[model samples]
Target: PESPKGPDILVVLLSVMGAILLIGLAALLIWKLLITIHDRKEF
Candidate 1:
């Protein structure tokens, strides 16, 4: 019988890294959009 608790540290680390990258990208995009909107004014 195999142990249910497998130490897959590499997989977990990669998943976390991917998530962080995605979140960072999203934040950057949102910031850029907000900045652009703020800089624009209606004549």
Candidate 2:
């Protein structure tokens, strides 16, 4: 019997890396909005 271990791990790793990048982009956008609002109040 042959095992498909080599390619399976690569696929899982790529999926996780993609998910983290997406979450980071969303957080950055929300943080930018918060900063913009806070700056307006200080002036």
Candidate 3:
């Protein structure tokens, strides 16, 4: 996938998210999945 910015953007984004990730598994399952495809390096 194409990176959004510097290498720090990945690790700094691992945690510290809201409770929705656990409470709403759909968020991670769907939203993150969407982002996975959305960030592809197809350019």
Off by over 4 Å in 3: 1-23
Top of the candidates by lDDT: 1
CA deviation > 4 Å runs, candidate 1: 1-6, 41-43
Instruction: Per model, state how many residue pairs clash.
Output: 0, 0, 0
Across residues 1-43, which tens digit of lDDT does each residue of candidate 3 receive? 4855566544556443544366688766888888889899877
**Per-candidate alpha-carbon RMSD to the true structure:** 2.7, 3.2, 17.3
Assess each prediction's global lDDT (C-alpha) against the native: 0.87, 0.86, 0.67
TM-score of each model, paired residue for residue: 0.74, 0.69, 0.35
TM-score of 2: 0.69
The alpha-carbon deviation from the true structure for residue 6 of candidate 3, after best TM-score superposition, in angstroms, is 56
- lDDT winner between 1 and 2, please give it: 1
C-alpha RMSD of candidate 3 = 17.3
What lDDT does candidate 2 reach at residue 28? 100
* Tens-place lDDT digits, model 2, residues 1-43: 2765577467778888889999999999999999999889664
Tens digits of lDDT, candidate 1, 1-43: 2765555577788889889999999999999999989999856
Stretches off by above 4 angstroms in model 2 are 1-6, 41-43
User: Cα deviation of 14 in candidate 1 (Å)?
Assistant: 0.3
Ranking by lDDT: 1, 2, 3
Q: Distance (Å) between predicted and true CA of 41, model 2?
A: 6.7
Supply the TM-score for candidate 1: 0.74
